């Protein structure tokens, strides 16, 4: 079959945008694809981490994987750090990227604004995130549509090394979401919800608690036109919440806005507060047994095996294209 | 005994420059300390290398290493690329490491200059050369005085790690030769002899044949002033000529004036091409056995399992005090 290459770094925050966009993907299609899930450690790392921190953060994020349903039997789940692999085949890219072309991207771009003194891992992340695409001859990367740019300089990249020493990459392509490819934050709907957003009524974390999913929902902005319709463009709030009711209640837009015709906010958001909650108790539920289990690590311990053992094979093709060592 | 690091890009032109700043000291050096000795393949291309000439050039640079003496029983030969612990200690220094640090480099501002587009690796060179030295808890890297200033960073970046992570990296220090540091083109005495010069008279290579370092020394550029008496800046071909003269020889700049008190160029010249030819034919001989033995694959094989043994350890640390991975 084709193989599905996506990673998420582990962070304090996994939000519903993180669920919607991605997490929600993958436990879609992992049946139907070779799959690569990973826990982009090194990534992380690229602004800086206590390291008590990173270190549970991982095994929080390993331990979401597993709850949301990846299920190791079908997907192959792993730490970016644990697969030498990925630091090698990101410096060999390194060497054929542009510093002009790592300067353009959005993403760096946002992460080092205003910013005094800038960390090089911070630009040079896209060549390890096209390492860890490449190293797997990915066809498919599933992510929201804020990882769309990292992915075109990836192709890129592909196609550069390609060019150069000869066919070796598969050209890989993005597969965003036509519903929730970009989650918008609850306290301003024209911006991306974001993990690190400072107001934490933005987002709505995988481990929120009833009380809190309802008080962030009801506080939701939205508008004075007591309208359930979508117009992004209009109303971005109503619009925003009306996405994430449709991807987690597996009920379209349009069923939606019949079903709340002549219905006001206050319902609406009850009943979305309700779906959030449906939603995220049972993945919690299973998160907290992973969390204290031991197979968590031997889940890890395995998907790492699999990940070294077909990235270390590719690596030692790009060194052979490159003429490195013997 | 104290550790000792040094590290040689595999290229198509080896100098006699390198062979006095940096290989004479590591066979000086090798029975008295712990010694790493690097074929740098994964520096080598942060500039666009032909595969087939890198793979015999990595061959051809091991080979020369061996010629010029480095001892496999007294010291650990290796390739850079076949220690993944490099390529996985750059990236994690690179997450440290500020841009405007990189950007600051001499040795990156010359390579990239009066470019149109450069490449990342050019930036990022100074990190993989830190990890190079830090991996092995190096007390001294011998070179001549252009490494100098990657050293400096190389200090930087240890004492950042050990400050934010804890004490984990011995900081380095240079040995730079006092004759000899800093050997000059032949053709433009105030430029530094360089692999690279488009003028092939302004260096000798060391496979370079006697007709040919006959031809080279005597075209070197000198002055009008026919006396032979060390002064930089007054007359740096003289100067340049003398340094070496003396290294290679072993005779002082004082013995060497004494000598040719009241000589000219002619005879000194002839003199110090046939000093040069002493010295590069055995390199020579050596040379061409190890390029058509089996036994140069042996030796790196040897050493590339000592440094993945010690290397492979200072990763799992690195990773340790950043809370990597598990
Ligand atoms: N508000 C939102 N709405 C919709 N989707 C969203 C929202 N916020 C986040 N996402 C998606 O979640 C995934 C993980 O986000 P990260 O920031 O860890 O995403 C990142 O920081 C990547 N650089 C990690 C990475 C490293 N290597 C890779 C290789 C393939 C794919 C991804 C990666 C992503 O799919 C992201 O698009
Ligand atoms: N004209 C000259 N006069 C005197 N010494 C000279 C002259 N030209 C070159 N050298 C010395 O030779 C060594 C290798 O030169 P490279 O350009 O490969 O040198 C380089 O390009 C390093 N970045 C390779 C490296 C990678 N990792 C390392 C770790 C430790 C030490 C060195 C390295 C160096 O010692 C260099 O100073
Ligand atoms: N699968
Ligand atoms: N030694």
Not at 12 to 30: D, P, S
Not at 195 to 203: E, V
Request: glycine share 6%; charged share 25%; aromatic share 8%.
């Amino acid at each position: 079959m084709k193989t599905i290459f996506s990673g998420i770094q582990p962070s304090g925050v996994i939000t519903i945008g993180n669920y919607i966009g991605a997490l929600r993907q993958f436990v879609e299609l992992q049946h139907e694809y070779n799959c690569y899930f990973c826990i982009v450690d090194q990534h992380a790392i690229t602004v800086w981490q206590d390291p008590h921190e990173l270190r549970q953060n991982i095994r929080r994020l390993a331990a979401l994987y597993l709850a949301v349903g990846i299920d190791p039997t079908q997907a192959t789940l792993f730490i970016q750090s644990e697969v030498p692999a990925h630091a090698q085949a990101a410096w060999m890219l390194q060497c054929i990227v542009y510093i002009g072309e790592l300067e353009r991207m959005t993403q760096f771009k946002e992460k080092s604004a205003g910013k005094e003194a800038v960390s090089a891992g911070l630009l040079t992340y896209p060549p390890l995130m096209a390492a860890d695409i490449l190293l797997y001859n990915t066809d498919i990367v599933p992510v929201g549509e804020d990882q769309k740019q990292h992915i075109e300089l990836t192709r890129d990249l592909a196609e550069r090394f390609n060019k150069r020493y000869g066919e070796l990459f598969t050209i890989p392509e993005a597969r965003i979401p036509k519903v929730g490819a970009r989650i918008m934050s609850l306290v301003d709907p024209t911006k991306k919800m974001s993990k690190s957003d400072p107001n934490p009524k933005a987002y709505i974390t995988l481990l929120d608690d009833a009380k809190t999913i309802e008080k962030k929902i009801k506080s939701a902005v939205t508008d004075s036109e007591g309208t359930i319709r979508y117009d992004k463009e209009a109303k971005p709030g109503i619009s925003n919440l009306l996405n994430i009711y449709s991807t987690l209640s597996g009920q379209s837009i349009e069923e939606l806005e019949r079903q709340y015709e002549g219905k006001g906010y206050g319902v609406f958001k009850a009943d979305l507060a309700q779906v959030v909650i449906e939603t995220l108790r049972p993945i919690q539920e299973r998160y907290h047994h992973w969390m204290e289990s031991e197979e968590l690590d031997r889940v890890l311990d395995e998907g790492a095996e699999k990940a070294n053992r077909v990235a270390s094979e590719m690596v030692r093709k790009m060194e052979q294209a490159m003429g490195l060592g013997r």
